[PDB]
Design a protein around this ligand. Structure first.
Ligand SMILES: CCCCCCCCCCCCCCCC(=O)OC[C@H](COP(=O)([O-])OCC[N+](C)(C)C)OC(=O)CCCCCCCCCCCCCCC
Ligand SMILES: CCCCCCCCCCCCCCCC(=O)OC[C@H](COP(=O)([O-])OCC[N+](C)(C)C)OC(=O)CCCCCCCCCCCCCCC
Ligand SMILES: *[C@@H]1O[C@H](CO)[C@@H](O)[C@H](O)[C@H]1NC(C)=O
Ligand SMILES: *[C@@H]1O[C@H](CO)[C@@H](O)[C@H](O)[C@H]1NC(C)=O
Ligand code: NA
Ligand code: NA
Lengths: 180, 180
C-alpha cells in the first residue's frame, strides 16, 4: 500500500556507526519501529564525529502517487560553533520516484572546539496537502566540531577553515595567502 | 660615493598617482628632497585606494659595499579593518646588488569599510652596524578598505574575502561553499 522509503545506505552507515548495513528510517510510508519511542532512540544517537562533515540519506516515492517534502527548519542552536545545517536540494520539492541521495551538511566554523545542537525539521505531504510524515516534534541532533589549525598557518589576516585550507582575503592567494 | 637606491617604478607610480614616472625615494644613499619636511610630504600622501591590495618598491645596493635592511615594525593600528602589512622578503637581510622588487601587502579583512592607519618601520645599516637610513620617526600611512560582497554570497558559514572569493570551511568547496 505505502510507497515512501527513507534510509541510510550501507556505505554511509559503516562510516557513521561501524556496521555496513542499510539503516531503515521509513519503509512503505511507515516510520521504523526504533523511532516510535524517540527519546529512547535519541539517547542511542552519539554526537556526529569531527571527521564527518556531511551525511547522505536516500529516499524514494516508489509508486505512482506523488509526494512533496519541505524543510521547515535547518537551524544551529550554537551559531558560534557550527553554522546552520544545509541540504543539497531545494527546500520544497517532489520526493523523487527514482531513489536519490540528499546530502545534509554540518558546517563547523573552525573557530571553537565543542558540540553544536541543531535541528532538521522536515515534513512529507501527500497530493491532498496533508502531512503524513515528519521529523519527531522537538528533535535535537548533535555535531562534534574542532578548532581549525592549518599547516604553516594563514598569513595576511587569513583564517584556517575546517577542511585545513586557508581562507585568504583580498588579492591574496595560495596555500598560506602569500601570492598576489 | 653613495650607492643605495629606493624608488617606485614608473608602472606602479601610474596605478597609484596617475603619472608614469619613477618616484625617487633614496638616491646614492641620500633621502629625496621631498622627504626632508616629512609632515608636509605626508599631507600630500592620500589613503591607498580600495583597488590597490599591494605596492611594489624597487631597491638596490649598486656598488661593492654591503648593506643590511631590517623591518622593525609592520603594524596595523586598526586591526578590525586591515591586518598587519606584510613584505615578500625576510625581515632581516642584505640589500641586493641587482635591482629587485619588494612587494608590501595591505590585507583588508573585508569585514568593515573604512581607513586603516599602519606602520612600515624599516632601517638600513652599513657593514659597521650603524643605521644610515630609516623610515622617518612616527610615520603613519593609510589604506582604504571595503566590506566584502561576493556574487551569490557564501553558504555553509563561509565568508567573502576582499578578492571576491568565498572563504569555505571544513569539507566545503567551490564558488559558494556548496560542494563536498
Ligand atoms: C533527507 C531527510 C533527513 C531526515 C533526517 C533528520 C536528521 C538529519 C540530521 C542528522 C541525524 C543523524 C545524527 C546521528 C548519527 C548517528 O549516530 O546515527 C546512527 C543511528 C543508530 O541507528 P542503529 O544503531 O542502526 O539502530 C537503528 C536501526 N536498527 C538497527 C535498530 C534497526 O541511526 C539514526 O539514529 C538515524 C538518525 C536519523 C533519524 C531521524 C528521523 C527523521 C524522520 C523524518 C521523517 C520525514 C521525512 C520522510 C521522507 C520519506
Ligand atoms: C621596501 C621599503 C619600503 C619603504 C616605504 C615605507 C612606506 C610603505 C607603505 C606605503 C607608502 C605609500 C602610501 C602612499 C601612496 C602614495 O600616494 O604615494 C604617492 C606619493 C606622491 O609622490 P609624488 O607626488 O611623486 O611627489 C614626490 C616626488 N616628486 C615628484 C615630488 C619628485 O609618493 C610617496 O609619498 C611615496 C611614499 C613612501 C615614502 C616613505 C619613506 C620611506 C623611506 C625608507 C628609508 C629606509 C629604506 C632605504 C632603502 C634603500
Ligand atoms: C555521499 O553521496 C555522494 C553522492 O554521490 C558520494 O559522492 C559520497 O561519496 C557519499 N559519501 C558517503 C560517506 O557515502
Ligand atoms: C609588482 O611586481 C610584481 C613582480 O613581478 C609584478 O608581477 C606585478 O605586476 C607588479 N605590480 C604593479 C602594479 O606593477
Ligand atoms: Na592565520
Ligand atoms: Na556568507
Amino acid at each position: 500500500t505505502g510507497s515512501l522509503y527513507l534510509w541510510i545506505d550501507a556505505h554511509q552507515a559503516r562510516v557513521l556507526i561501524g556496521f555496513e548495513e542499510d539503516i531503515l528510517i521509513v519503509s512503505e510510508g511507515k516510520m521504523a519501529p526504533f523511532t516510535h519511542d524517540f527519546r529512547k532512540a535519541q539517547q542511542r544517537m552519539p554526537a556526529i564525529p569531527v571527521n564527518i562533515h556531511s551525511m547522505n540519506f536516500t529516499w524514494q516515492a516508489a509508486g505512482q502517487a506523488e509526494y512533496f517534502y519541505e524543510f521547515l527548519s535547518l537551524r544551529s542552536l550554537d551559531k558560534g560553533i557550527m553554522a546552520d545545517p544545509t541540504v543539497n536540494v531545494p527546500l520544497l520539492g517532489t520526493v523523487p520516484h527514482k531513489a536519490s541521495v540528499v546530502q545534509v551538511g554540518f558546517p563547523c566554523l573552525g573557530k571553537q572546539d565543542g558540540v553544536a545542537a541543531f535541528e532538521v525539521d522536515v515534513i512529507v505531504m501527500n497530493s491532498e496537502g496533508n502531512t503524513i510524515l515528519k521529523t519527531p516534534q522537538n528533535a535535537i541532533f548533535f555535531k562534534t566540531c574542532q578548532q581549525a589549525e592549518c599547516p604553516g598557518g594563514c598569513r595576511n589576516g587569513g583564517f584556517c577553515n575546517e577542511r585545513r585550507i586557508c581562507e585568504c582575503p583580498d588579492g591574496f592567494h595560495g596555500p598560506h595567502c602569500e601570492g598576489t
